[PDB]
Design a protein around this ligand. Structure first.
Ligand SMILES: Nc1ncnc2c1ncn2[C@@H]1O[C@H](COP(=O)(O)OP(=O)(O)O)[C@@H](O)[C@H]1O
Ligand SMILES: Nc1ncnc2c1ncn2[C@@H]1O[C@H](COP(=O)(O)OP(=O)(O)O)[C@@H](O)[C@H]1O
Lengths: 438, 215, 225
């Protein structure tokens, strides 16, 4: 009895201007694959998009990517209205400008470098006030649409004139950076990723539920696993992606403080994260603060260990605050914390398998011109047992290996580099092959 | 073992025999400043004799009173004795009782079991199946369960779970129902009336799920 | 489309007054083995040198040693211009002086001890304002050229009078000590030495790159052993 409302869920097709429904739901709203749909959302906000069928997608849900949700002002698991839009006319004029903080650095002709291959032969449906993302020149450029000739909303057919005029613009207060971290930056471990959300879904997203029912959320979540395996990442993702307030407790950064002033921080950390709730408090490197008491030869070394557990209990359910933690192994840390009062919930962010490796390889190659011979599938399948820092630097150094060759050539020119010089810069399977020796 | 119902039983007994209850939460003391740690520990007793007959309950005793081999510390140990002073300063006739909870006998200082103070020691072990079932029942008591919900089965498969394990198992299996009906409610967009809640059923497939989650 | 510009790379012949190109690059600039070449570099700076063929050397690159690069004001991997110089006349007078901090200690006749066996039968191309290094007497002596009779630049043939006159001189602000440590002081481990440079090449040498690209350098390097 509310058909056109829908839930928001992950993109499987990560093109900017494509949303995906189930096959029934298209039959329900009398929509056709390829039709331009219009979606409305919070803060009076509209986006226009191309609809497609997804066999996997649940009837209730709609798959879309950050670019989209951003202009709608929603986060994952929110609700929006979708209605057809076969009244959209081809555009004559589009006045697009870049957001200054995605362009400080690269120089040259954005019109040519990013906009041209993006819009080319796509017939994209845009809208006055959209914010979109282009991937090249070893970075991402964010563009806002200031005016279109068929206002508000128009299609971009080959015919369309694209006004690149003048200034890079400043970022508005509530428009988040598509540069910022999110789930689409994560790879390999999908299972765990879910388990996290669903625990944290209700208390973060529907915080007023738990004052109204006697039931209790998680308070604490712990992250197992090898180092650099995406722990610090996932956490910052989840908060940014569920719009939660984020406060970081960087283990060593506390232990570096003066005695007692260590605790003084640890309080204010919580104290603030209850003021700005619903919140994640994230403890990176927990074994730096809370090791097994056998390891704690120290009065003040231990004073903190308890000081934590005090605040971890002083944490109300109804404060709707959650604490996530990251350590290197369970044995590292004090057992008391896994007392089913505080860090009851414990996730094994392990290693990637080949499919996961591949996924991650993809995630860092996303802003680079790869050559046709580049076979990431291969790269993954031989790199048994690599974490997503391993695989991420593997990219970085294989890119730097291409930059070195073209760099010799550039040095003869002696010129600093325009984006255009960057866009022409290819990365090869022999540039990868190399970074493998490391 | 931890979360086995120790902190529970204690607060039950006091509420159920109308005794005055004062809680000494181990870490909560050790989190204090040196000496102000002791200053509390006195007032704790001092008050519990004023409000007698009373149970003074020490949750997580191994936090305050570990084996002296573990107590590399002057003030870490100063407290350990400060307890034993008050445990003796406890009159019989004060009709006050102290209950304590630790994770294992080896955890704690042997002196306390000196037949002066903690002479009496109870083994709150794990549940058997019948006990599990009992506990499952105890947290399902405010929820509409579906006819297919067979707690008997749940208990019977869940070998070796403590009553925190089994209690959260419920909580998350309920949250798992709340999620589905929650999708549906989100379309309404309404916050929830009790009436909405009363209609909210919990299923064996809602339970089945919360089983994947491990402890 | 800029042929005469070249990259700077390690010396394989560590004689002071010899630079080495590839065999194609000599055919490209129409240079002959033994020809006196003139090289220009940053801060208005010139050096003059003898060119040779190196089979190993990459066409793009030029092999030279610290003595050289110093007077050019460049470090490894920089760019310079090389042009022939068959107009260099034999020298009559050369007014050379030592730099005080490479001579406090040793006493005696520098003219005889260091300059004489150095210049002997070499036909070295020097230049007014060059800084060169001599190896003997259990140390290294650094000499600056204050004036030459065919100014600015001249060859040193047996005929040449070498004026050793007077004072040791102080070091100028930007002229680094060739006494100072460098790669030519290193031995054995060649592989590692490369691996280091290349990591540290881009961020140290081209530091404004990494504000302009999302890619990241190394931050830390550790040394086992
Ligand atoms: N699965 C992954 N997907 C994408 N990036 C990853 C992944 N795993 C690791 N990374 C990269 O490596 C780094 C991971 O470090 P992090 O999770 O912060 O670990 P830790 O706290 O374990 O040191 C991140 O900066 C990220 O760019
Ligand atoms: N036998 C049981 N019957 C009912 N509930 C239990 C039982 N054992 C544990 N629980 C539940 O789990 C928690 C037990 O925690 P607690 O007794 O405080 O453990 P500890 O002091 O052992 O950490 C309680 O909050 C309670 O709801």
């Amino acid at each position: 009895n509310r058909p056109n409302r829908l839930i928001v869920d992950e993109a499987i097709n990560e093109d900017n201007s494509v949303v995906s429904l189930s096959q029934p739901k298209m039959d329900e709203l009398q929509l056709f694959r390829g039709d331009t749909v219009l979606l409305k959302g919070k803060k009076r906000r509209e986006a226009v998009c191309i609809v497609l069928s997804d066999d996997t997608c649940s009837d209730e849900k709609i798959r879309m990517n950050r670019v989209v949700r951003n202009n709608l002002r929603v986060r994952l698991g929110d609700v929006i209205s979708i209605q057809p839009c076969p009244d959209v006319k081809y555009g004559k004029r589009i006045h697009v400008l870049p957001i200054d903080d995605t362009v400080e650095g690269i120089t040259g002709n954005l019109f040519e470098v990013y906009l041209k291959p993006y819009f080319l032969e796509a017939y994209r449906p845009i809208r006055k006030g959209d914010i979109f993302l282009v991937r090249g020149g070893m970075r991402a450029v964010e563009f806002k649409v200031v005016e279109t000739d068929p206002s508000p909303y128009c299609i971009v057919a080959p015919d369309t004139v694209i006004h690149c005029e003048g200034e890079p613009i400043k970022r508005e207060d509530e428009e988040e950076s598509l540069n910022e971290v999110g789930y689409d930056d994560i790879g390999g471990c999908r299972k765990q990723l879910a388990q996290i959300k669903e625990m944290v879904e209700l208390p973060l997203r529907h915080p007023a539920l738990f004052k109204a029912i006697g039931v209790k959320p998680p308070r604490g979540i712990l992250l197992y696993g090898p180092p650099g395996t995406g722990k610090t990442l996932i956490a910052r993702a989840v908060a940014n992606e569920t719009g939660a307030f984020f406060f970081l407790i960087n283990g060593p950064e506390i232990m570096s403080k003066l005695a007692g002033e260590s605790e003084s921080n640890l309080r204010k950390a919580f104290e603030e994260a209850e003021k700005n709730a619903p919140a994640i408090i994230f403890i990176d490197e927990l074994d730096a603060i809370a090791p097994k008491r056998e390891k704690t030869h120290g009065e003040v070394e231990r004073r903190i260990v308890s000081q934590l557990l005090t605040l971890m209990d002083g944490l109300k359910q109804r404060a709707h605050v959650i604490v996530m933690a990251a350590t290197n192994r369970p044995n590292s840390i004090d057992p008391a914390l896994r007392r089913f009062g505080r860090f009851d919930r414990e996730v094994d962010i392990g290693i990637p398998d080949a499919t996961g490796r591949l996924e991650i390889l993809q995630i860092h190659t996303k802003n680079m011109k790869l050559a046709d011979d580049v076979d990431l599938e291969q790269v993954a399948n031989e790199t048994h047992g690599h974490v997503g820092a391993d695989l991420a630097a593997l990219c970085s150094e294989a890119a730097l290996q291409a930059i070195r060759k073209k760099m010799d050539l550039i040095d003869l020119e002696d010129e600093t580099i325009d984006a255009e010089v960057m866009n022409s810069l290819a990365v090869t399977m022999d540039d990868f092959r190399w970074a493998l020796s490391q | 073992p931890p979360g086995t119902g120790k902190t529970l039983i204690a607060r039950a007994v006091a509420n159920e025999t109308g005794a005055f209850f004062f809680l000494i939460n181990g870490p909560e003391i050790m989190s204090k400043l040196a000496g102000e740690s002791e200053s509390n520990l006195r007032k704790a007793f001092e008050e519990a004799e004023k409000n007698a007959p009373a149970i003074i309950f020490i949750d997580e005793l191994d936090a305050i009173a570990p084996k002296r081999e573990k107590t590399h510390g002057e003030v870490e140990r100063r407290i350990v004795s400060q307890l034993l002073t008050l445990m003796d300063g406890l009159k019989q006739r004060a009709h006050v009782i102290v209950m304590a909870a630790t994770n294992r006998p080896n955890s704690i200082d042997p002196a306390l079991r000196r037949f002066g103070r903690f002479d009496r020691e109870v083994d709150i072990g794990i549940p058997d199946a019948t006990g599990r079932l009992e506990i499952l029942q105890i947290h399902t008591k405010n929820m509409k369960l579906a006819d297919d919900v067979d707690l008997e089965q749940v208990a019977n498969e869940t070998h070796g779970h403590v009553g925190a394990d089994l209690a959260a198992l419920c909580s998350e299996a309920a949250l798992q129902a709340i999620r589905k009906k929650m999708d549906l409610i989100d379309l309404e967009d309404e916050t929830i009336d009790a009436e909405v809640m009363n209609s909210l059923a919990v299923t064996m497939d809602d339970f089945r799920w919360a089983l994947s989650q491990s402890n």
